[PDB]
């Protein structure tokens, strides 16, 4: 919310939230102060009757580290683009990948879920990504009604330095080689839902020779999803197979991943907004005698008062239900429990 | 000032200042350009009846290095809250310690003096500090005009990482383990206020096995203070002991310390504003033969030319009386004096 | 430039830009994804009938690297200023260093050009500078406008010639000064000169191989035709111990020319064509005489309207492959640039 400008067809949103939060935890890498604040602005230009452009930037600022502390902002979106009207639009630049357009019906858990689980950013095409080019399409050409699809185009981004290299360079966990992924969802009756998605990205040498964990040439995610929404009830589920493609925490990749979450929801007339939810991701023939392993499994239970649009506060417990093995501890998964308390203004 | 949104119960606040500063001085640490800028957003909504929700963001950036310069910009004030009426507030972020409520009486100069003087920024609840829980009341339940008090509870902000360790982990004379603190201030007349405060802190290990100097398990401060503010004028006075609480510099933290700062302002009509000062911090029982040592000890002259409310500018000379010794050149703390010039625009 | 706020004699204005960018080349430091944005405001306060008060900040925030990656902010103008009606101006803080209110006249290119091509940015008063005080006057008390400006010094993180912003050799400076003159001769003609002054640092004569002498200078004539839909104009610039060889030091002396041309079709197409180079003398270490930048520069912007436009640049890069450009570590490679933006 909150349009500061708006004058000769030319529209800017500034939007953001503020959000005092804190973790209870026996992990003390997540154990303590959370708070932190986004702060965004859309823009959006009428150019002639069929074609508009805009833009959209947001900037995460963590506030729970001192003053002389590093690295406490980041860009999560920064891209512009055109709307042809209902011939679709394009927008280049950081954004979510097309697989999240599916992935993001489980993400809306009070505090937990979404990016950081069963998938991660700079992740190839399955959250906010550098360098996407983006098409997607409204209501098939105007013609079939809730019917949406996208497809989307990732360049190379490389290695720091050496052969693999480009400008932008990291390190093997958030490298990405070419790729591509489409999305697809369909609005069966109101209020349910299902959708598909499915992405291709080459691997990178650095992926192929640093990390011990995770071979091939080719990253592949295949994704269904499922959803509910009306008469106060949110249900969603959504799995996904992934080849090459999902974190074993520090370890580097699985070579086959299965992920699943489902989520179930309940909206009180007064504002309560109760939670529960399962999360999982299985992983298959990891190198080094590592075999299956569980990379992430918990149950999710947790609140949300809205006081109105701009002013909540929620409680989430994470339930944690790994087993703590050699596999969770070199590969830095946390085992434990956590209980989030948070109070969030938004404009 | 600048209300850029007011719609609908929701009103938005974006303030700051440019503020065009150098610093001439023998301490080629402190010597130079100075440019830095200030830039936040208070926002308010309006929940119902006797509810109003609320937060504020203050962000620092620096513009007086490159651009290619590491670390030049942080956040000072995160935090969301709940007013009830005359029930109270309650906020939790990063925000300021009850301690400032009191201390903040003598932070005035056209300047120097305030945090980086006496105290410093994470440094407990003395000033700006992450993860504070903050009731206030304001008028005594609207019983007793005049009459403000505050509670403050902190949780523990502990190492990098070992047995101490927390997520928002950071340097020993920047960790606190979990404390309180508590406030009161009385107007008697419309002009003159007294006020105390007082804060309890544990210490964490980094603390007592890092640096050479300070030792205990408790960081503690008794703060009285005295104001002036009407009819043109301006006098304050602030007087506190601290315990395990005080920096020695870059040596630790003093066993024990008493700070006195004291300033005296005039406000003529035509917009010039000259300030005297006297500012000192002595400290006791330091270990490895300091014994008794002046922390900080200068008298600070300047003024203040208000163009109007929006763009000033000013001068201040802090006279440097500390002897240059063992312990001044083993803290790193500064014995040269020091002259600002500046020009600032505020919004 | 978006005013959001205009009230009692004080105005604000919100200003930026979203660069959706792609750089194609073989240069693997320069290849890749490019975008990033840029976000600042403009403030200006009546503070009586002959005196206004005013600031500007403007940052730079790249969005093309990782959540976890650093240093990916950074200030590029913050000053305050005041304005005593048309009598001229003062502001004191980060901005411009005068050199630029003429070499700012080849600075036209879809992408490339500007800082980082013939000078760079935290280099003397060439381009923007930290801690520049600076008067300005219109109308030399006709048309004429005139500038003087003082730096203070900027010197190393530690030592000797330390100061509290300290920062490696290639972006310090001693005291220093600079003056600009420029005018409107026709309509549509304009001629501009400007010279800078600075002393130099004891790590700048000490610490890089390349670039000796107490003092950095830069004479500036140029020359711009801008009237018809067509743009025109030139920059030749020659420097004493303040252009930079690279990662390799200073070049003692060097020249550098910056020339373009530019049409401007009433459908918003824009047709680019420019010229660059950087010619260095007297270099250390055997080197001599050499190229320090070379190439040739074709594009075009569409432009939607005043909020969103489109463009492709092209660097014909001229340098020869040879031992000064590959230990100082400058591109000879090709370079094509797409991107769209969005402007507010």
């Known amino acids: 919310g909150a349009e500061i400008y708006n004058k000769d067809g030319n529209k800017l ?23 932190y604040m986004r702060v965004g602005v859309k823009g959006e230009t009428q150019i002639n009757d069929q074609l508009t452009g805009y833009g959209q930037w947001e900037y995460n600022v963590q506030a729970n580290n001192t003053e002389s502390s590093s690295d406490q902002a980041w860009t999560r979106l920064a891209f512009a683009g055109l709307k042809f ?13 097309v697989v999240y357009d599916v992935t ?11 990016d950081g689980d069963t998938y991660g950013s700079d992740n190839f095409l399955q959250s906010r990504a550098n360098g996407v080019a983006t098409y997607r399409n409204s209501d098939f050409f105007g013609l079939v009604d809730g019917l949406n699809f996208a497809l989307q185009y ?15 360079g990291r390190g093997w966990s958030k490298q990405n080689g070419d790729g591509f992924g489409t999305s697809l969802t369909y609005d069966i009756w ?28 080719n990253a592949e995610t295949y994704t269904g999803g499922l959803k509910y929404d009306a008469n106060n009830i949110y249900l969603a589920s959504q799995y996904t197979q ?19 979450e ?34 992430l499994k918990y149950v999710d239970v947790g609140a949300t008062y809205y006081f109105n649009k701009n ?19 070199n590969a830095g998964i946390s085992t434990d429990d956590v209980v989030a308390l948070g109070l969030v203004y938004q404009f």
Request: glycine share 14%.
């Open 262 to 295: 489902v989520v179930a929801q309940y909206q009180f007339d007064f504002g309560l907004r109760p939670s529960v939810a399962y999360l999982q991701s299985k992983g298959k023939d990891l190198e080094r005698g590592y075999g299956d392993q569980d990379i």
């Open 311 to 329: 002013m909540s506060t929620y409680v989430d417990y994470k339930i944690n239900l790994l087993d703590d093995n050699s596999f969770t501890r």
């Open 13 to 35: 949103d500034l939007y953001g939230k503020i959000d005092g939060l804190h973790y209870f935890s026996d992990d003390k890498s997540v154990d303590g102060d959370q708070t």
């Open 190 to 217: 109101d209020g349910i839902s299902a959708g598909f998605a499915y992405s291709h990205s080459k691997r990178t040498d650095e992926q192929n020779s640093v990390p011990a964990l995770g071979r091939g040439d």
């Open 85 to 97: 009207g209902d011939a679709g639009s394009f927008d280049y630049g950081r954004n979510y990948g």
């Open 242 to 260: 992934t080849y090459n493609a999902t974190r074993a925490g520090s370890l580097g990749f699985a070579n086959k991943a299965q992920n699943f």
């Open 154 to 168: 990732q360049g190379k981004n490389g290695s720091v330095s050496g052969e693999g290299a480009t400008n932008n």
């Open 104 to 114: 993001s019906w489980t993400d809306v858990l009070p505090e937990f879920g979404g």
